[PDB]
Amino acid sequence: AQSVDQLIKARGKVYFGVATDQNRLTTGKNAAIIQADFGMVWPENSMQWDATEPSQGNFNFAGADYLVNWAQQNGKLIGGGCLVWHSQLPSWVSSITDKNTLTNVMKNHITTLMTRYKGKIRTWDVVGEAFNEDGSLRQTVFLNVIGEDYIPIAFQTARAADPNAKLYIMDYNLDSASYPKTQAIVNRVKQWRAAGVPIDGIGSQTHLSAGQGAGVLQALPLLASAGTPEVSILMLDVAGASPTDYVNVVNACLNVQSCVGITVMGVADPDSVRASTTPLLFDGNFNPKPAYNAIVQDLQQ
């Protein structure tokens, strides 16, 4: 049928993307759909810390290499991440108690991953899920051991490793303008950038319930008011996959000049972590759902 990536590019955006990995690319009809309809791929798991650095200084790149090679052969942009994210850490990192040791470990992790793929990765998610729901910083091993400087250090280290990449901070529950986490991340990113921290983007990890798409029309412009060169929608899925919810999210990005694109959490409903809510754009037979066709219609205008 029609490609949402082709159409969103024709409207002046950069991509419509999807998360995947080697497993998915060799099963189902995922590779054919990604080839035809999406312009950017992200590794769901193969670039996370537990997958890439299972013991200190010893890296495993097999799965990440597979994705990067596949993307290059198929003409797709690549996003990578997450470089610093508490929920994907191997136990050897979480057990470090010394500030200088953890700082060097974090810098080496960032530099090694980014150097390997230098010039090939459009966007890196550098820090993920750093905020509590009340807007304070989440008390992870990095905050407890290094302190709040871990965020500036991570971004500075990433900028030096690959100056071509766009560097993002990413979080979830940024879907409502009035929710405390949303204004908190805006305030902190503005302050960090004023201090010279190279944060190029805010990525909103958008997991919606039915009817919540409309709120993104106000939340996304508010995130853009932090002044980063880019914002994006990441990890998108919507319980019930209503066309209304999906079109509202797409229109939010179209309405925000600095929104470069949208990435969905996967291809087909049965492979979702909440499959019983049928929250994706393709069904269990790999056919496009009404929400896919509604996005196509919205973009053709």
Of the pair 130, 235, the CB lying nearest ligand 6NT is at 235
Residues in contact with ligand 6NT by CB under 6 A are: 19, 42, 44, 81-82, 125, 128, 170, 234-235, 263, 265
Min CB(24)–ligand 6NT separation in Å = 12
Min CB(19)–ligand 6NT separation in Å = 3
| Rounded Cα gap, residues 207 and 122, in angstroms | 23
Helix-, strand-, coil-residue percentages of the chain, each rounded to 5:
45, 20, 35
Of the pair 44, 245, the CB lying nearest ligand 6NT is at 44
Going by their DSSP bridges, the two strands 40-43 and 201-208 should be labelled as: unpaired
Min CB(168)–ligand 6NT separation in Å = 8
Min CB(3)–ligand 6NT separation in Å = 18
| Rounded Cα gap, residues 23 and 5, in angstroms | 23
Min CB(234)–ligand 6NT separation in Å = 4
Min CB(286)–ligand 6NT separation in Å = 19
Of the pair 129, 245, the CB lying nearest ligand 6NT is at 129
Identify whether the C-beta of residue 272 lies closer than 8 Å to the C-beta of residue 237.
yes
Of the pair 84, 197, the CB lying nearest ligand 6NT is at 84
DSSP 213-278: HHHHHHHHHHHHTT--SEEEEEEEEETT--HHHHHHHHHHHHH-TTEEEEEES-SBGGGSTTGGG-
Of the pair 178, 241, the CB lying nearest ligand 6NT is at 241
φ, ψ of residue 178 in degrees (nearest 5): -90, -5
Angstrom CA distances, 173 to 9, 97, 125, 152, 188, stand at 27, 30, 17, 23, 16
Min CB(296)–ligand 6NT separation in Å = 21
Identify whether the C-beta of residue 85 lies closer than 8 Å to the C-beta of residue 130.
no
Of the pair 199, 234, the CB lying nearest ligand 6NT is at 234
**Which residues, in sequence order, are bridge partners of residue 137?**
131
Of the pair 219, 234, the CB lying nearest ligand 6NT is at 234
CA-wise closest residue to 37 among 244, 286, 298: 286
Min CB(71)–ligand 6NT separation in Å = 14
Q: Which single residue brings its beta carbon nearest to ligand 6NT? A: 81
Q: Name 25's Cβ contacts closer than 8 Å, sequence gap at least 6.
A: 31, 34, 66, 67, 70
For residue 69, what are its two tokens? 């090679």
Of the pair 234, 256, the CB lying nearest ligand 6NT is at 234
Looking at residue 66, its amino acid is: Y
